[PDB]
């Protein structure tokens, strides 16, 4: 069902990127918001196989930093996630990517009580995205089926990123 980026490249996809934004269900949004903010996101490959995502940002009035464990999972740029709190495992895909400005990634529940969980993911090399960049991932977001009020971009921020 869902796109890989051809020829995935990982070795290029590694280093920091800048969560920029995202949409999902409009429940999750209903109180996760007040107030989603901008993380910074650091890649690096995982010695049990796979990328390791490393992000912080600012919640409840302290910068926190959660890390995330993305497997191989049968293509190039198709991963899998297994939630540690109650086990729900996750399809994540990296679908669009030029590895020096963005990259559109998808997430879907698998397995456990998470399975219906739909969230897509904006990216991006730099705190300040172009238009034209916003632009690819409403469009993405858009053809996955998401409404428009549940697409949220995540202005710049200093606090949390240094």
Known sequence: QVSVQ?????DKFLGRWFSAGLASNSSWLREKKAA???AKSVVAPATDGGLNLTSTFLRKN????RTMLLQ????????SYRSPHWGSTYSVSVVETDY???????SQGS??????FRMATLYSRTQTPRAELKEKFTAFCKAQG?????IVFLPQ???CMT
Do not use: I
């Open 100 to 106: 020096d400005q963005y990259a559109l990634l998808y």
């Open 157 to 159: 921020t200093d606090k």
């Open 6 to 10: 051809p020829n995935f490249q990982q």
């Open 36 to 38: 989603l903010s901008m």
């Open 146 to 150: 998401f409404t428009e009020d549940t």
């Open 62 to 65: 302290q910068c926190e930093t």
């Open 72 to 79: 191989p999972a049968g293509s190039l740029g198709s991963y």
């Open 111 to 116: 397995k456990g009580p998470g399975e219906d």
